[PDB]
Amino acid sequence: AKTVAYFYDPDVGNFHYGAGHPMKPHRLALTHSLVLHYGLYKKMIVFKPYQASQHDMCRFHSEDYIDFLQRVSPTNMQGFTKSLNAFNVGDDCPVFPGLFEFCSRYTGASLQGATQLNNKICDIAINWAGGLHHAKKFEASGFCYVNDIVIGILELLKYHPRVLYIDIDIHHGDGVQEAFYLTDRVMTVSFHKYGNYFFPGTGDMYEVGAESGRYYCLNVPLRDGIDDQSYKHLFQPVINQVVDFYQPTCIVLQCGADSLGCDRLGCFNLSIRGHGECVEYVKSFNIPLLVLGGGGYTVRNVARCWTYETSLLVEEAISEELPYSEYFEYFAPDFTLHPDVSTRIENQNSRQYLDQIRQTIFENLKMLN
Amino acid sequence: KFINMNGLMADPMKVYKDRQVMNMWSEQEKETFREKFMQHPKNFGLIASFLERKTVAECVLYYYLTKKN
Ligand SMILES: O=P(O)(O)O[C@@H]1[C@@H](OP(=O)(O)O)[C@H](OP(=O)(O)O)[C@@H](O)[C@@H](O)[C@H]1OP(=O)(O)O
Ligand SMILES: [K+]
Ligand SMILES: [K+]
Ligand SMILES: [Zn+2]
């Protein structure tokens, strides 16, 4: 029935951010490995993806910022001290070999996905390499250099009057929210841990948009330890009413796996099944769908999450047992698709808090009829 | 035949397998990686520089293919 395009870049995983850095591009290699060994490619149109140029990128980002990303290298940094500070490169966003190639590679696939949805080449396009939602017009942020999401949504807007952006990463999708804050042509919905200066420190419930974009931006701020059932209890009602009221002609879903229990950076308690319930619910609306990756810092769990979500998107029930492959040992000791990722830590989201949250969200939603 | 002009992969498994078949590291290469690594951990830029037929991306790939085994 549904045509699913899947972008497989054999090279996009062969990068390393540096010693100590939680972002591991090779998590994309593990994901592809499992996706292929499960035979899921048989249900998808698999593309070696387009690579984005500065021309593509500068439809959103500044010319000098992108220029700097091409110019800076591990060996020439000493002469770029002021630029590193100005462009916010060097800390969360380090200089590593192949930085620009990696950006071009992940962005390109997002853009091609948008392009194929526009052309009705497919119903669902998947780029696990994309979804770097923090990057701003002229600064790097939060492990993200180029905001492939905004670039992709710009492309969708050529044909789509209304684009719904849904962000499931544990972090507030601030870069996407900023780019589109003043317009009603993209509605940004973000669920995230908020409070106690947890990065990026924004995505307060009162951030609802401005100018003609007032009420076309929605933030759901959560505390530590949210579980499947509680998350589902918010997510499904909110999204259902967003779709009804806003009537998007296209959806962009950022599927950051750092909202899983036992994530290296995250403090949520979602299972792989719970996270997949969100993806499947978005799929149920039968609206053209661009599916992106994003955060995810327990490599072994990230690869499995996105593999399982691939199988859902393709409507294929795959075995709990992982097939043997070059990365089999990464999945020790269980070697299973659905390991226990429970935090076994107390959920900080009281019923009162969630209802106080619930009531302000639906009040905001009322403004769109 | 396995990849079209426009990048459509007719046989994605064959494409993937091809990348593993090109796991052609000699013992001089293998040994240089290790010594350069323990000296400079995860400095794959530096490691690649001491390897005539290995780039920084191949070094990253080798690291992940072997760091268990
Ligand atoms: O999950 P992996 O990426 O395979 O390995 C990371 C390792 O990252 P690498 O650079 O080897 O991919 C990571 O290294 P770093 O401290 O440099 O991020 C370890 O801390 C630990 O989480 C380690 O995880 P562990 O093997 O589960 O302890
Ligand atoms: K989010
Ligand atoms: K907006
Ligand atoms: Zn995140």
Domains and CATH numbers, chain A: 1-369 (3.40.800.20)
Residue with tokens 């200089």: A95
Q: Ligand 1, closest atom to CA A20?
A: 17
Structure-block tokens of residue B21? 């078949």
Of A48, A50, A97, the CB nearest to B9: A48
Instruction: Output the CA angle A230-A233-A239, nearest 5 degrees.
Output: 130
Among residues A324, A9, A360, the alpha carbon closest in space to that of A215 is found at A360
Alpha-carbon dihedral A207, A196, A292, A243, rounded to 10 degrees: -40
Q: Is A41 on the interface with B (CB under 8 A)?
A: yes
Residue with tokens 């929210």: A177
Which residue blocks in chain A are alpha helix, DSSP H?
26-37, 54-57, 63-71, 81-87, 99-118, 148-156, 174-179, 228-246, 272-283, 299-313, 351-366
Among residues A120, A169, A171, A129, the alpha carbon closest in space to that of A148 is found at A129
Interatomic CA distance for residues A276 and A273, integer angstroms? 5
B57/A11 touch (CB, cutoff 8 Å), yes or no: yes
Structure-block tokens of residue A92? 């969360």
* Residues contacting residue A101 through CB under 8 Å, at least 6 positions apart: A15, A51
Interatomic CA distance for residues A357 and A231, integer angstroms? 12
Pocket lining: A19 vs ligand 1, CB cutoff 6 Å: yes
Interatomic CA distance for residues A8 and A44, integer angstroms? 11
Interatomic CA distance for residues B13 and A34, integer angstroms? 11
Pocket lining: A24 vs ligand 1, CB cutoff 6 Å: yes
Q: Please indicate whether residue A134 is annotated as part of the active site.
A: yes
Cα of first residue to Cα of last residue in chain A, in angstroms, is 33
Among residues A329, A172, A324, the alpha carbon closest in space to that of A254 is found at A172
Distance from CA of B28 to the nearest CA of A (A): 22
- CB-based contact A91:A134 (threshold 8 Å): no
Interatomic CA distance for residues A275 and A268, integer angstroms? 11
Q: How far is the CA of A163 from the centre of ligand 4 (A)?
A: 22
Counting one residue from A and one from B, how many pairs have CB atoms under 8 Å apart? 65
Distances (CA, A) of A197 to A178, A194, A335, B47: 19, 8, 36, 38
Interatomic CA distance for residues A122 and A144, integer angstroms? 27
Beta strand ranges found along chain A (DSSP E): 4-7, 45-47, 124-127, 163-167, 186-193, 217-222, 250-254, 289-292
Structure-block tokens of residue A59? 């439809």
Q: Which entry of A134, A172, A192, A275 is annotated as an active-site residue?
A: A134
| Residues paired with residue A227 on neighbouring β-strands, in sequence order | A269
Q: Is the dihedral of CA A300, A303, A307, A313 positive or negative?
A: positive
Instruction: Output the CA angle A277-A280-A284, nearest 5 degrees.
Output: 135
Pocket lining: A332 vs ligand 1, CB cutoff 6 Å: no
Binding residue per annotation — A169?
yes
- CB-based contact A254:A291 (threshold 8 Å): no
How far from chain centre, in Å, is Cα A187?
A: 16
User: Best interface-test mutation with B: which of A7, A14, A75, A300 has the largest number of B CBs within 10 A?
Assistant: A14
Q: Give resolution in angstroms.
A: 2.1
Structure-block tokens of residue A54? 């500065």
Interface of A with B in 94-133 (CB under 8 A): 96-98
Q: Look up residue A168 and give its DSSP letter.
A: -
Interatomic CA distance for residues A38 and A59, integer angstroms? 38
Neighbours of A78 (CB within 10 A): 6
- Give the domains, in start order, of chain B with CATH numbers: 1-69 (1.10.10.60)
Among residues A117, A138, A345, the alpha carbon closest in space to that of A227 is found at A345
Interface of A with B in 275-314 (CB under 8 A): none
Interatomic CA distance for residues A316 and A200, integer angstroms? 36
Of B3, B64, B68, the CB nearest to A29: B64
